[PDB]
Amino acid sequence: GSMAEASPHPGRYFCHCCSVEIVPRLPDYICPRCESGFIEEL
Amino acid sequence: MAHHHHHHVDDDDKMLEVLVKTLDSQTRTFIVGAQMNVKEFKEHIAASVSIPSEKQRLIYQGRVLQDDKKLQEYNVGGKVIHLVERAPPQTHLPSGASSG
Ligand SMILES: [Zn+2]
């Protein structure tokens, strides 16, 4: 996006379970907030 | 098929056992091909998950899987996807007459 042109940086995920943005634990693609993998990369 | 008899096997690597969770309580399978739909697939699972393909968002490996591509692009044979519900895209989709 505006930050990192055409480069998907994984500091922006969204877990819909927390309804709050997260920075996941990639190895599993878990959410740091609840460890449910209902995170999509933004 | 019934009475096809033209190479009884064909899928082999194809034919996914599409596992898909909804929020936490559930986890349901949507067995299809590897590259069969995803598009029409989402349309099909819409009721089973109570999520219509238009709002419906398949997330696996944090990837936003949608009707735009094929299943094998996401390689979800035998893995549970994560379904979610977003905020209404009314600002994204003006004129809510056609399918609105
Ligand atoms: Zn969470």
Q: How far is CA A24 from CA A21, A35, B2, B28, B82, in A?
A: 9, 8, 47, 24, 15
Asked if residue A18 lies in contact with residue A24, where contact means CB atoms within 8 angstroms, the answer is no
- Rounded to 5 degrees, φ, ψ at B88 are -55, 135
For chain A, count helices (H), then strands (E): 0, 3
Way it was determined: NMR
Task: Cite the beta strand spans of chain B per DSSP E.
Answer: 19-21, 28-29, 57-60, 63-65, 80-84
Report the distance separating Cα A29 and Cα A23, nearest Å.
Answer: 10
B positions 34-93 inside 8 Å of A (CB): 57, 59, 61-64, 82, 84-86
| Closest to B59 (Cα-Cα) out of B85, B36, B97, B37 | B85
Sheet holding B57-60, edge to edge: B28-29, B19-21, B80-84, B57-60, B63-65
CB of B55 within 8 A of CB of B99?
A: no
Pick from B21, B62, B86: CB nearest A39: B62
Q: What is the CA radius of gyration of chain A?
A: 10
Distance (Å, whole) CA A2 – CA B56: 26
A17 is in an annotated binding site: no
**Stated length of chain A:** 42
Q: Which residue from B66, B65, B59 is spatially nearest to B82, judged by alpha carbons?
A: B59
How far CA A2 is from CA of A5, A38, B53, in Å, comes to 6, 25, 29
Domains of chain B: 1-100 (3.10.20.90)
